[PDB]
Amino acid sequence: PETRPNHTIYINNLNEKIKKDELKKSLHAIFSRFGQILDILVSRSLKMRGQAFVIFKEVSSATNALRSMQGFPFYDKPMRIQYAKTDSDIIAKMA
RNA sequence: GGCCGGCAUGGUCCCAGCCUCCUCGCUGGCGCCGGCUGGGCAACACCAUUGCACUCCGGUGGCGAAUGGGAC
Ligand SMILES: [Mg+2]
Ligand SMILES: [Mg+2]
Ligand SMILES: [Mg+2]
Ligand SMILES: [Mg+2]
Ligand SMILES: [Mg+2]
Ligand SMILES: [Mg+2]
Ligand SMILES: [Mg+2]
Ligand SMILES: [Mg+2]
Ligand SMILES: [Mg+2]
Ligand SMILES: [Mg+2]
Ligand SMILES: [Mg+2]
Ligand SMILES: [Mg+2]
Ligand SMILES: [Mg+2]
Ligand SMILES: [Mg+2]
Ligand SMILES: [Mg+2]
């Protein structure tokens, strides 16, 4: 359902027909305005398809991105967003 | 994509057309029928999947495809 605040947002219900490189770029296009993005992780494997991790440098960015883009129609599908359950390695490798 | 068999089929060159998972080719292929067989999921389609990762990594399918004109 939902979890504790995090630098990283977990996005799913994404259109699975879209390729990894395009998907990453399109996600930057709509999410960059919430704050600096450290990385976007995408895989098309059987387990990880339809999903993305957007890693913000500051948690407040993640928070605003989550509230604002919940259900945003993206490649004809309503985007579902939550905080990631765990910190991404890029975040742990800092603080 | 490869090989073989049967039948049909005069040769060389030119132009145009058509076909596609298999160099979309600046020279790849394209008579009819039938059997054997290779590679790969890179793209595409379909099936399955709503999945919390930081390790690339589900499956199946097609190629069971494609002809006119001219010069000598
Ligand atoms: Mg990209
Ligand atoms: Mg990458
Ligand atoms: Mg997967
Ligand atoms: Mg033969
Ligand atoms: Mg005869
Ligand atoms: Mg015959
Ligand atoms: Mg002869
Ligand atoms: Mg003649
Ligand atoms: Mg020609
Ligand atoms: Mg034409
Ligand atoms: Mg064609
Ligand atoms: Mg047979
Ligand atoms: Mg986790
Ligand atoms: Mg085959
Ligand atoms: Mg002729």
Domain boundaries, chain A: 1-95
Using C1' positions and the CA of A83, the closest nucleotide is B52
Name the fold adopted by A1-95: Alpha-Beta Plaits (3.30.70)
Q: How many CA atoms lie within 13 A of A84 on its CB side?
A: 20
- Token pair recorded at residue A83: 């905080």
Proximity of residue A56 CB to strand B below 7 A: no
Strand B, nucleotides < 7 Å from a protein CB: these are 43-45, 48-54, 56-58
What are the CA-CA distances from residue A73 to residues A13, A46, A70, A79 (Å)?
10, 23, 9, 6
∠ Cα A55 A14 A31 (to 5°): 35
Residues A51, A57 contacting (CB under 8 angstroms): no
Phi, psi of A42 (to 5 degrees): -140, 135
- For ligand 12, the distance from its centroid to the CA atom of residue A61, given in whole angstroms, is 63
Backbone angles phi, psi at A82, to 5 degrees: -145, 165
A58 and A35 in contact (C-beta within 8 Å)?
yes
CA(A76)–C1'(B51) in Å?
Answer: 19
Q: How far apart are CA A49 and CA A62, in angstroms?
A: 21
For tokens 């296009």, the residue is: A29
Q: Record the resolution, in angstroms.
A: 2.3
| 3-state helix/strand/coil string of chain A | CCCCCCCEEEEECCCCCCCHHHHHHHHHHHHHHHCCEEEEEECCCCCCCCCEEEEECCHHHHHHHHHHHCCCEECCEECEEEECCCCCHHHHCCC
